[PDB]
Symmetry: D2
Subunit: 314 residues, 4 copies
């Protein structure tokens, strides 16, 4: 038998890259941590803010620490930036959310790990300074969906690729590439509990989805509650996902460095779009490692519609 | 080591039941089919209306056919009712949805199997006639959530019990019992794409959730798109789930026999409620095996609120 | 898909048996314990007279204790016979070796669980008295080989059947039945370290295997060191297995109740033979629960050859 | 959590090596193929000279072919040497036995993959010429035991290390290092069916093991029938393993390049010894890729004893 492995896939690409490939042992060190996570999660009740939320976070760090490719780490789970010591230093800064949606593990709701990889280009000894660059400085990014199946969407400068983990061989087999997203969708996904809090554009948009001006049949609504779940659905059947700013929290809820920025690199890399409503999520220069941002991503056409609105209203 | 297995759990209950226990080899024949399903689904991309949708449906029938406990089967996937031939006949009629949400497998969205078990009490040779009884005639019912973990909630006359499948030992280990649902929740889950189509009560209700009359902070909104997913979330953190009638399809979308009725037996058995808005889902006498019904279930208090509305408006 | 499960297989046989089937929940309670064992063993180094040797022994007892089919248990790992208390009593006495060959786990040598099941026919409150009957009083017996694959050979009054555990579905799928053993083999398996200790027959036999009197090409020699491994090889390619008496230990080394007797029920049930050299292992009336016996089993023709010798010499 | 992975282990060693590390993606490409093999084998009966014997052989080649580290491959399963084409060429020549002991898979006997890695040092376009070097030119070698657990012993210039595959995470976790073998053992393992065929030394040796001249208690005898099984036992509890020349086949049965040579690199690297009786297996310059050699390996002291004999007799 032949083909295929992520590793077998990444390396073959970094050949023509043509690269020193430490990127490869990074995604490897990463996959292992992902495989460990995937197994822990399918047996949460047999194993008895969440415990593993801690558990994964380390788990992931330790694999990254020992990949010999990283020099600065950012975990949605750490006060400050973790610096890789001199023996194990690599040329990569990796931002990640060890386990997104643990606030909702209990529903056997799908959850996942989000990551972004920047090449530290500084010559200075590493520090947070290196972890605050624009999204557009991503060499590689993606996530890991621990759903009915454990997938991993990886986007790199070339395009978007999907890998499903075959539990038995403990390998991530490439099952789709290079993914691209329908130009227009039939779905809007947003937490409408905040109807009260939303701005006019969002309000008018949603309105436009429920009652088509032209009267086309109305969009669907899906909101799972797990970002990595929602986007991916969005990335597959297209559509749009919204976690916009609300007056109470002006900058949304999703952390840009490890949550918003990556989903964007992916979205844009698959033909999608990612905006705050005010600007491309990716061109935002961050000042705070844990700073948040509102986010509107998905099918290029739908995202525009919203934008035209936001523009209309500003 | 000791404890625990469903089987080890059911049998111990049918002892004081005190029963002939064929119910037991039914849930066994069932679990096997569930374990087969769970594995197929975690490797859908490596395996390449849905193919398995057929696959599971048989798979499930064959295990039930050979449980020697069943005499009539109803699959959301079959024109007519399947009758178990004389050699393999049991005293049970089992209604089920082999794989709910396959219309959404592609998102590694959680999916599942829903089932209901009636004791054929007739003395007539079996037929569909036996599969159309009120929900209240359920000896046992529940579902199987193939999410990040593969759980199985089983409700029986006594109460509601939850089992997580430990992948390694291929066993369903009891991880929660006897489940009961918060009396009031912080969530409403409904497809709002149909805002246009909904009736006044539903409309006014949702309105009341977004902007609290008393001004309590508004509910959350979650809609995953997979019934078995949504309810279970509902059953765990409580709340409410709605797939109400809309003028276009006056009786909702979810099939009562294999989808609505079971979720109700469960809901009510855990302290919840299940109404069409007009009546308890369970007291509906069905005329058509594949007949549908609208459904409002979840936290007892929330469900009432809606009801008081429906009453208010009728 | 359809077929096949042990359970699905045993039950279908106890139907025409036609039985009350508690035998079934016994092999079920058993299989679970076997599945637990199989998993522990494939990860012994990751888990860090042997520890599990204890572990399995309980594990097995607890499943048997709760099968509600047993009333007296014999473990190569217990000073006295375990009596099942009144609430959980069944009509079966089960003799077993939780984990044979743990003295050799370290070589990732194959190891296994050996069991025998007698129907207590007494009307007396149960006790060891019930666990000491002739082999010929076995209702069911077999073993579990935890090798490259985890098989389970089960022999019952009808014939011999083999089941391989499919790790994924946690089910024992029937892969061979009804097994029968070549009438003559090309192999002898015996620990020749004891050349010094062996009697003349054994000595002359072995001699006859290395240098054919007629000059046919000599037998093979295989000795793995794990009884359950050796016999099964013997049962598959036929041949003969010997652990005969030696002057130092006149009655061999293998314990009759849980080790020798079962292998015999199996052997004879597959067309093989099992002798001490003096008599059929099965007709021996035991006085001591932990009493041993020498054992010569395998291809009917080979076993005879040895016997004719033993006879020749006595 | 932290530690440990082979990869995580090899790479850390090739750092101080300090190497270009393609050796690493070789053992990786290798492990994958090993994981694929391990799974196929534990479900041989559910999957229905051997079929997989072919299957593995390719499987292994394809992973090696795509490791980008190899330039010439030798499979006990191929007429001639496989040359890696220009795009995928690496600086390594890898000799291997895809699946040793398939002649004995049927007994759920343990089986395995044996490999040896030479650095092609030639400047010539690659060919078999490169695959025929002395054992002493091994950069890395080892095997994979698919027994009750799936281990992998890897020996490299530094010492011998053992890795057990944790089925769940699909990772080879280091469980022992750096292995060394008892200086003397209590076991001899040899196929005595060939008593007739053996030479005087072998004969006298065995004789000396059954009846101690000094009268120490006699050795044990173990012969599993699977080389990778037997040696490893030998490597763990020490002892000695013999597959010596017999007049009928003067050069033994085990193929030096892929079977004998590696077991030696390992043995000697763990403090053991490996001789034909005439010379160190490792210093033999091969002329034929598929050429065989007799082999005597194991505890240093025991091996000598035999040697002193061979010397005594020549
Ligand atoms: O130099 P490295 O370690 O190969 O990293 C660069 C990698 O990043 C990429 O730009 C995509 O992530 C590839 O071109 C290449 O594989
Ligand atoms: O419950 P809310 O306010 O809609 O926020 C849910 C969001 O939070 C997360 O759980 C992470 O904070 C995401 O998975 C999801 O998009
Ligand atoms: O007679 P049976 O086959 O045991 O079935 C009855 C079972 O149904 C129950 O009412 C619950 O499903 C239990 O009392 C009992 O285990
Ligand atoms: O997409 P809609 O119209 O909200 O319906 C989704 C419903 O359909 C189902 O997929 C089954 O028909 C359920 O899982 C879910 O509740
Ligand atoms: O009465 P039970 O519980 O079915 O046990 C008897 C079983 O034993 C057998 O003799 C074989 O073990 C079968 O005839 C039958 O399945
Ligand atoms: O090492 P010896 O003396 O040959 O005995 C090995 C025997 O002991 C056992 O390990 C059980 O006592 C069997 O598996 C095997 O037949
Ligand atoms: O140059 P490479 O690709 O790292 O290969 C050399 C490897 O071989 C070794 O000699 C052992 O196999 C190590 O020193 C080193 O890891
Ligand atoms: O059956 P024999 O002649 O002892 O040879 C067995 C040998 O053959 C092999 O199966 C490989 O040829 C080895 O595993 C084992 O050492
Ligand atoms: Mg987190
Ligand atoms: Mg998060
Ligand atoms: Mg269906
Ligand atoms: Mg459905
Ligand atoms: Mg034991
Ligand atoms: Mg034993
Ligand atoms: Mg081979
Ligand atoms: Mg071979």
């Amino acid at each position: 038998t032949n083909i295929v492995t992520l590793t077998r896939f990444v390396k073959e690409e970094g050949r023509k890259a043509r690269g020193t490939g430490e990127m490869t042992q990074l995604l490897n060190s990463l996959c292992t941590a992902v495989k460990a996570i995937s197994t822990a999660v399918r047996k949460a009740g047999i194993a008895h803010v969440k415990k593993l939320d801690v558990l994964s976070n380390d788990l992931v760090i330790n694999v990254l620490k020992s990949s010999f490719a990283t020099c600065v780490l950012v975990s949605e789970e750490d006060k400050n930036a973790i610096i890789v010591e001199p023996e194990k230093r690599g040329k990569y800064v990796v931002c990640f959310d060890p386990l997104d949606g643990s606030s909702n593990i209990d529903c056997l709701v799908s959850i996942g790990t989000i990551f972004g990889i920047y090449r530290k280009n500084s010559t200075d000894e590493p520090s947070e300074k290196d972890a605050l660059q624009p999204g557009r400085n991503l060499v590689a990014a993606g996530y890991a969906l621990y759903g009915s199946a454990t997938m991993l969407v990886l986007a790199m400068v070339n395009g978007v690729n999907c890998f499903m983990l075959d539990p038995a061989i403990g390998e991530f087999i490439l099952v789709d590439r290079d993914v691209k997203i329908k130009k227009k969708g039939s779905i809007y996904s947003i937490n409408e509990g905040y109807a009260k809090e939303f701005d006019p554009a969002i309000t008018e948009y949603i309105q436009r989805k429920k009652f088509p001006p032209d009267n086309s049949a109305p969009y669907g609504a899906r909101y799972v509650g797990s970002m990595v779940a929602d986007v991916h659905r969005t990335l597959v059947y297209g559509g749009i996902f919204m976690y916009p700013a609300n007056k109470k929290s002006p900058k949304g809820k999703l952390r840009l460095l490890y949550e918003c920025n990556p989903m964007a690199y992916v979205m844009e890399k698959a033909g999608g779009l990612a905006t705050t409503g005010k600007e491309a999520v990716l061109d935002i220069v961050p000042t705070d490692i844990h700073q948040r941002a509102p986010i509107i991503l998905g099918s290029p056409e739908d995202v525009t519609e919203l934008l035209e609105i936001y523009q209309k209203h500003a």
